A paper describes a structure:
Alpha-B.1.1.7, Beta-B.1.351, Gamma-P.1, and Delta-B.1.617.2 variants of SARS-CoV-2 express multiple mutations in the spike protein (S).
The potently neutralizing NTD-binding antibody, Beta-43, binds the NTD in the so-called supersite region. Although the epitope is slightly removed from the site of the Beta characteristic three-residue (242–244) NTD deletion, comparison of the Beta and early pandemic NTD structures reveals a knock-on change that significantly shifts part of the Beta-43 epitope, conferring Beta specificity.
Author numbering:
A (entry chain B), F (entry chain L): 1 to 212
B (entry chain D): 13 to 72, 75 to 179, 186 to 249, 257 to 307
C (entry chain A), E (entry chain H): 1 to 229
D (entry chain C): 13 to 71, 75 to 180, 185 to 248, 258 to 307
């Protein structure tokens, strides 16, 4: 099929400008449209016909298409411009509307924040059901990338772990969750289990024991 | 590819003009200087009936005006008067479906394409352009002429070029004899605003293709200018007949004048005495 | 009043069918070509199909060709998408969008998808509708601030989304944090909902989490109480 | 996919050992702490006959095949290998497209559990080749079934990286197919260089029970083959209806067991509900 | 003396059958897996099919599945390719190659195609097959060196490729230069084979070019002599 | 359905090093073999098993599969190394033997060699067959680029001209041919025809006449 290439991520400081590259085959002969999609809502057309803005899009946005160089430009970048941007064309050679791979535009500025790690042991009610789930809740960290690792006593556990990918809370920080499922015998035959969270070179390790 | 469908299909009524004295071509490729030469070939008789249509290249607006399928007979004189190159080519054949072979001579912007296949042609052969505002140039990006093309026997693609997207007169004579599709062409810049221009211009040999197919009908292919949202092209069709012509070459080899021997008793005596003088 | 309203999405097992709808209002529906664009969770935009202003032409995506059918009703201002032989890779949010047709042509050189709908969610999973097992997360002050304890509810092994967790029937609003669910390798979701409350009230104040799972008509009001030593 | 065919088909002669006191697992779905409990389930009787074969992972165009074995009421499966030669098993009845079949295989990325109408190969093949420029083995051949239609179950764990190729590893399994449920119990211990099965006691923990709902009467072991320009050994014993007396400690672990019908000493041990033989 | 000699190529209409052969010699044929690789004129290499050393296994390209069948005879040391329902896009030069088998396996991780054949031409076209017109090119000593004149043969208007040209039935090889054919806009090929010969012995020594156009089963032995203008 | 990508063109000077790149999805886990196809010959294996050389390939050929980059390296390039190079792997994800799109290696910078032009008039036998063909043969030129012009008397000839693309000979030079097709009377009606061969700013013109 017809391929539309975009850089996966672009970072810019407020007030500066961001340039997003749409990569296409003979795209100098095609009419490129651009869409902004902030997380949670439908995309919005911001540039059509390579350079035309719809009635409501501010004049900070503009597009070009000259010398096989199609580009979306956002000057005086604001925090509200943090969204995913896609280029899109009509490829008559394959009767396909093709959307680009996408570009995440994050605005550099927010300082790093350390995760808060809350670790709950299996409830007595769950053990009565002959099951046991360790719940590790990770919250209020930035950027939104963590690695979670579980340990039985002091040996790593890779089986029975299920971890979410980070998601943006309502405060621009990120939350994530990790669960460790084990038999009630495993929960009680060990002296402790640990949830280890690494975030930007620092580790927060919480530990729970059955004798609680 | 995939044909574009049109819900409202119409075609303009045909109209008639006259061939004047056009359609003369060089029958052989022999250098002839300052002499009168007579040959019996398929020529367009002087003052022949000519049908002419229009190629609507813009919609301004949901009616598709289609070009008609015309007979080929023993050959055709095809001429077009347009500013920008609206007339793009023709399809030739008999049934014009997948049951028989069909000739396709089309001129997309890059080069000329000549193919002979078992085409399954579209109902409305489409050729589209759109204006690239950021380059200030037209780019053709739609080519929907046939839905299928199998068991091909001939393919020809010329070297690439750039076609520019004061009227122009482009004339063609198509002859399908002994398995060869012979083409003759001539381009002169005409000053007329409406109708075929009266005058004489000898068509030079373009190419003869060993296609080896039978041709009884043909259809004209034009370009459509896609616009966001009146000077259309006109083409002329006359039919060749077996005639004896008396051709006049100048000192350089150009055919300057001709005499249609069987047109009238005056020309019949012009060819018997082998002279171009009507006061004799 | 220009708006597009998608509907018809739902949770379905592989092989089954589903018909999507998109009601348009506020503009001339027969003057625009209508599209379907789906977005898999966490993934980019994928074009599905297009139908021209009068339904005389339609182009499909290779991934859905032979299984999806697009159509439109111009005296009802409605776009349709018939989805047969659904697979797990058809799970996405499906959007409809308009684009102006020039003069019988809806190619997309001069106009793009200027108006998009809210969207409708389609999930294709071999799982079956299951209500959640809810367990208390007894309060702990180890990771909260001074004088504060965090208690919670473990809403485990349910399908499909979503569940809603409130506390004390809405009387407890602040300091609540319902975490996004995890899609376990078994195909079922689990989530947690913690609220941080003062320590000095755990002796007297009662805490109940109100779990609601509409797709299985399950409601659990789990009382959470401190651990006794 | 497409099965690789072998014109020279052989299999090593079987060998016999003894189950000693292995194969005990947690049978019930109730947490039990600090109690001596007697249950009647499918156990591997103490000191029962055990057949053990070899998984040749490199060998002359001789293809040594693993045999198709009965399932009976359940199997105790164990393997003693250094690198993980044993990859999984296929379970079913006819083992063709006419019936459904369970497939539990562990390729380098993750473990895969599927139930389809498989058309299994005559010689199920799993290949690795040595990438000299990376100094590492990479498995690139997976030819277990040629067709897989009308699937009713699929389970894939999260991806990982399996370590490819004298403390051998002991991996033991108990497989039970009861009322459409395929229940698995497992135990992994770093074993010492013993002749066959190691002497000792170790209760196998519940791994997973799969609601497959199919009929299983035969099975076959799947191993890896090292394509090049000792081997692994597995042990199979069969479960029987026995009454066992299991002892749980305060933490829930099965610390010891008694095969009540093994000998007169154990018969009196279960009558008195005690585990002391010098009384 | 390891050799792979393909044969059996020709020209067929779309839909008809054709059988190829690859005669091996000079090695243990039953120890190597045998391949077929085709190459369209002016294009890259495209693998067709493989067969293992003892014929127990074989793999096919998706573009030939259900249409081609590969086989081998280990006592005649011959590889076969049966081609059915031929299409235009199957036109190519077809090579056979060998690949060593380690121990009942011919995957190709440790060994490649170490010996190829010269190839055999397969043309599948709906176009008409046309035999060549062979005319002499009278000796011209203008652009030659010393006592040497260049005469030759014009092989005009044939379809399809290939043709081969020898001189005096292979007895004259030194000085021969056969130029690659031209594909005229008509779709027909034309080539020229010349040979530089002594100048002062043109009317006493006989020179005959041996044109062979196997696609049309045409053989011309044109005698070339000095012209008599 | 596995892609093996290669750069289409690689040009190196004599005595320098040509690096032929081969790309593929997770190609660092596959065993790549390399083949060399000289103009008009069957392919020849030069590198197999990523880096092993067959019995007769010279030492200056070497392959690499370390990193995620597969590469064929031709050191101290000679004139006979002008060929097409294809990488090839066995893909088990599709049970296909997959070749690469190919890389044409041209040795640029060899000494310039002037073309030899030989022009033949129509034979008397072809004229009796109602045809006339002018054969213009061009041999032994480097670089492999010529332009051919035909003249009727002293006027450029429009159509009827068929010219080959240059082809490498046994001596690493190039050869080409051009045909002018005429009718016998057309040939008889002109005073002369001329083959005009231009190569590196110098022109060779041969002329024939219907008298001879
Ligand atoms: C113009 O056409 C040529 C030839 O393509 C053929 O004819 C077309 C009209 C259509 O029917 C095609 O499906 C036919 O195959 C095109 O030439 C191709 O150009 C591309 C680069 O653009 C090149 O990669 C291909 O190799 C060329 N193919 C051939 C056979 O020459 C050309 O691109 C067309 N130009 C435009 C502007 O559409
Ligand atoms: C191994 O042998 C089997 C049977 O001889 C081959 O399987 C058959 O393949 C043909 C096509 O070649 C199919 O039409 C049959 O349906 C297959 N039958 C079965 C039972 O599989 C198999 O292809 C051979 N292996 C290889 C690698 O070719
Ligand atoms: C291509 O042609 C195939 C064979 O057609 C037969 O042979 C030709 C030469 C004619 O004589 C014709 O009348 C014959 O039927 C067809 O079988 C095939 O369908 C054709 N291809 C397609 C795509 O239709
Ligand atoms: C164009 O239409 C083709 C067939 O449409 C048929 O004719 C029209 C008038 C309607 O009556 C319709 O119900 C019929 O099926 C399609 O095969 C073709 O795909 C269409 N092309 C596009 C681009 O949509
Ligand atoms: C033109 O055609 C009409 C009939 O349509 C005929 O009567 C008339 O004579 C023709 N005129 C010429 C000049 O051929
Ligand atoms: C405009 O389009 C043509 C092709 O039609 C291209 O060659 C050219 O580079 C483009 N831009 C400019 C500035 O010429
Ligand atoms: C072309 O086909 C038509 C339709 O059968 C036939 O009447 C006509 O005679 C044919 N012409 C030639 C020259 O074969
Ligand atoms: C013939 O050509 C010559 C130059 O070649 C030119 O001067 C002369 O005008 C031409 N003859 C005519 C009648 O145009
Ligand atoms: C599934 O089983 C039915 C019989 O119940 C059979 O007809 C069908 O072919 C099977 N599916 C496939 C893909 O073979
Ligand atoms: C297992 O096989 C028996 C014997 O044919 C049959 O009666 C029974 O229904 C089967 N069970 C299932 C779950 O298919
Ligand atoms: C070799 O494989 C390992 C993973 O097993 C990978 O980390 C490493 O990058 C690879 N190295 C090369 C040179 O391919
Ligand atoms: Cl898309
Ligand atoms: Cl448009
Ligand atoms: Cl191998
Ligand atoms: Cl002859
Ligand atoms: Cl050919
Ligand atoms: Cl070649």
């Amino acid at each position: 099929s017809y391929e539309l290439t975009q850089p996966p991520s672009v970072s810019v400081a407020p007030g500066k400008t961001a340039t997003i590259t749409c990569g296409g085959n003979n795209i100098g002969t095609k009419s490129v449209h651009w869409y902004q999609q902030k997380p949670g809502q439908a995309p919005v057309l911001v540039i059509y016909y390579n350079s035309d803005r719809p009635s409501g899009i501010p004049e900070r946005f503009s597009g070009s298409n000259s010398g096989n160089t199609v580009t979306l430009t956002i000057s005086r970048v604001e925090a509200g411009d943090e969204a995913d941007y896609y280029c899109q064309v009509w490829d008559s050679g394959s009767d396909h509307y093709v959307f680009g791979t996408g570009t995440k535009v994050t605005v550099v500025g927010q300082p790093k924040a350390n995760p808060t790690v809350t670790l709950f042991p299996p409830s007595s009610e769950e053990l009565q059901a002959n099951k046991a789930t360790l719940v590790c809740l990770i919250s209020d960290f930035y950027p939104g990338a963590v690695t979670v690792a579980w340990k039985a006593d002091s040996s790593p556990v890779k089986a029975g772990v299920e971890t979410t990918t980070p998601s943006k809370q309502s405060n621009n920080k990120y939350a994530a969750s990790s669960y460790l499922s084990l038999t009630p015998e495993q929960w009680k035959s060990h002296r402790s289990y640990s949830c280890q969270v690494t975030h930007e070179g620092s580790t927060v390790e919480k530990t729970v024991a059955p004798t609680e | 590819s995939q044909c574009v469908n049109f819900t409202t299909r119409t075609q303009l009524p045909p109209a008639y003009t006259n061939s004047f004295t056009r359609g003369v071509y060089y029958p052989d490729k022999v250098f002839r200087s300052s002499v009168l030469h007579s040959t019996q070939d398929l020529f367009l008789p002087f003052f022949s009936n000519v049908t002419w249509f229009h190629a609507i290249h813009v919609s301004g607006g949901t009616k598709r005006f289609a070009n008609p399928v015309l007979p080929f007979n023993d050959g055709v004189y095809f001429a077009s008067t347009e500013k920008s190159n609206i007339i793009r080519g023709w399809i030739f054949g008999t049934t014009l479906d997948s049951k028989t072979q069909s000739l396709l001579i089309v001129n997309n912007a890059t080069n000329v394409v000549i193919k002979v296949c078992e085409f399954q042609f579209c109902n409305d052969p489409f050729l589209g352009v759109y204006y690239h505002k950021n380059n200030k140039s037209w780019m053709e990006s739609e080519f929907r002429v046939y839905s299928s093309a199998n068991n091909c026997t001939f393919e020809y693609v010329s070297q690439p070029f750039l076609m520019d997207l004061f009227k122009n007169l482009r004339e063609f004579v198509f002859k399908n004899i002994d398995g060869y599709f012979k083409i003759y062409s001539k381009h002169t810049p005409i000053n007329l605003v409406r109708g075929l221009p009266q005058g004489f211009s000898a068509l030079e040999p373009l190419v003869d293709l060993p296609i080896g197919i039978n041709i009884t009908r043909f259809q004209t292919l034009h370009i459509s200018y896609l616009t966001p949202g009146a000077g259309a092209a006109a083409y002329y069709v006359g039919y060749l007949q077996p005639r004896t012509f008396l051709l006049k070459y100048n000192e350089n080899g150009t055919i300057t004048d001709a005499v249609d021997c069987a047109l009238d008793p005056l020309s019949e005596t012009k060819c018997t005495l082998k002279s171009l003088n009507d006061i004799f | 009043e220009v708006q597009l309203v998608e509907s018809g999405g739902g949770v379905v097992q592989p092989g089954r069918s589903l018909r999507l709808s998109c009601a348009a209002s506020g503009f001339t529906f027969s003057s625009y070509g209508m599209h379907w664009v789906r977005q898999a969770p966490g993934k980019g935009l994928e074009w599905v199909a297009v139908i021209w202003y009068d339904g005389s032409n339609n182009f499909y995506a290779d991934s859905v060709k032979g299984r999806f059918t697009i159509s439109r009703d111009n005296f009802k201002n409605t776009l349709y998408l018939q989805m047969n032989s659904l697979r797990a890779e058809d799970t996405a949010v499906y959007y409809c969008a308009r684009s102006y047709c020039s003069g019988g042509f809806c190619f997309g050189y001069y106009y793009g998808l200027d108006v998009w709908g809210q969207g409708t969610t389609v999930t294709v999973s071999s799982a079956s509708t299951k209500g959640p097992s809810v367990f208390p997360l007894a309060p702990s002050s180890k990771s909260t601030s001074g004088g504060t304890a965090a208690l919670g509810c473990l809403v485990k092994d349910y399908f499909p989304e979503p569940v809603t967790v409130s506390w004390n029937s809405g009387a407890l609003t602040s300091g609540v944090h319902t975490f996004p669910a995890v899609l376990q390798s078994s195909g079922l979701y689990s989530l947690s909902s913690v609220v941080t409350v003062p320590s000095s009230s755990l002796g007297t104040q009662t805490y109940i989490c109100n779990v609601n799972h509409k797709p299985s008509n399950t409601k659990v009001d789990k009382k959470v109480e401190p651990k006794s030593c």
